[PDB]
């Protein structure tokens, strides 16, 4: 018997043939090194998004920014991290502040619920609000 | 878009998006009727002040 | 894997202008929820070389 851990919380005569010898005269042109490198970042599967999806609980998550600020936001944050990739001051390819009037764009955030409602207050707490508002208690 | 466009008669231009919108308000529109009546207002203060 | 989107080298009525993913089966109407996608002003997300 044998077990595998996981690796995610749950619930809780002579021998020596003649070809063998070995003579490593050919180096590789691309590099193995240097292809196994590139290739090492492009195995990398794309980052989760859990932004404007609700919880255990049932209040969504994310923070309380308007989308179209959102999305800004977000395509600065690219830029900055393409400049970081590419050891440069400046991005010599950007996602923000470019020709295209994209001012009708939206992403998803944490701000609205899936009612189309407003996050101002969490979902948990309307829900205890109005069901606290009914009960009855013993009579005096 | 247009309405800046046609005042500054071409040498600047001015760009808005192309796709379904969140239906913004922005009330700015209003009758000649009402231009002209604020126009009489205004002159009327102004008239012999130097 | 790839997405693409058929190019035309000068055909105007048939240069693709959007894209969105549904939900609901073709034979209910509802509350029309178009996705995110279809609000860029390009097909898709902007990018400037």
């Given at each position: 018997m044998k077990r595998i851990p996981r690796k995610t919380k749950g619930k809780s005569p002579a021998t020596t043939e003649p070809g063998t010898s070995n003579r490593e005269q050919y180096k590789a042109r691309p590099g193995i090194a240097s292809v196994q490198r590139a290739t090492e970042s492009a195995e990398m599967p794309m980052k989760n998004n859990d932004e404007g999806t609700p919880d255990k609980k049932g209040n969504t998550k994310g923070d309380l920014v308007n989308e179209h600020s959102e999305a800004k936001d977000e395509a600065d944050e690219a830029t900055k991290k393409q400049a970081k990739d590419t050891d440069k001051s400046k991005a010599q390819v950007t996602y923000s502040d470019t020709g295209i009037n994209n001012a009708n764009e939206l992403s998803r955030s944490g701000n609205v619920d899936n009612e189309g409602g407003?996050?101002?207050?969490?979902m948990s707490t309307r829900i205890a609000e109005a069901t606290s508002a009914i009960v009855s208690k013993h009579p005096a | 878009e247009w309405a800046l466009t046609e005042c500054a008669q071409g040498y600047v231009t001015v760009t808005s998006p192309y796709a379904p919108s969140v239906n913004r308000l922005m009330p700015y529109r209003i009758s000649n009727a009402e231009r002209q009546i604020s126009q009489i207002i205004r002159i009327m203060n102004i008239g012999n002040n130097a | 894997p790839p997405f693409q989107v058929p190019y035309v080298?000068?055909?105007?009525?048939?240069?693709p202008t959007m894209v969105g993913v549904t939900r609901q089966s073709r034979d209910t109407i509802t509350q029309p929820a178009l996705s995110?996608?279809?609000?860029?002003?390009?097909?898709?997300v902007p990018l400037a070389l």
């Open positions: 407003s996050n101002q207050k969490p | - | 080298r000068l055909d105007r009525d048939r240069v995110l996608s279809t609000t860029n002003t390009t097909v898709g």
